[PDB]
Design a protein around this nucleic acid. Structure first.
Length: 79
RNA sequence: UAGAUGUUUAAUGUUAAUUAAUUUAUUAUUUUAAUAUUUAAUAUUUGUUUAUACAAAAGUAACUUUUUUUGAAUAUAAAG
């Protein structure tokens, strides 16, 4: 079956770049967009544990590094 | 029956000098601010399918531990 990771080896980009193309551009980069306020995570009730939208959607986390290379230029590139 | 020729309330009423049966004459038709109806078997709601761009101001009901830079400090989501 078609696997992006086993595909990016044909394109050489990386794992974490082919995926960002196949999910909205607020789950990787630093643009404007609102997730849903239940995904925001909760506190720890007397009964239930804690939550966090980096422990609930580790895949949907913003790849702040991959934003460094693509969409924002450095300060040491224009000195 | 009942005073009288008809529009300025009667009260020691648990003596505001009391302590176990007060069984308290007490209420403004409407201008008040709270509730309850009636319209109401209602009007409106009803989620099985479309073609994706980035800034800023804008919020902060909000969380974060997880890789900001090789700059020290600072800050990275959300309307009207």
């Amino acid at each position: 079956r078609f696997n992006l990771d086993e595909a990016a080896a044909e394109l050489q980009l990386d794992e974490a770049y082919v995926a960002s193309l196949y999910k909205p551009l607020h789950y990787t980069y630093s643009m404007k967009g609102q997730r849903y306020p239940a995904e925001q995570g909760r506190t720890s009730r007397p009964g239930s544990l804690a939550a966090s939208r980096d422990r609930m959607f580790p895949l949907y986390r913003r790849n702040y590094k991959l934003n460094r290379e693509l969409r924002v230029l450095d300060h040491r590139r224009i000195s």
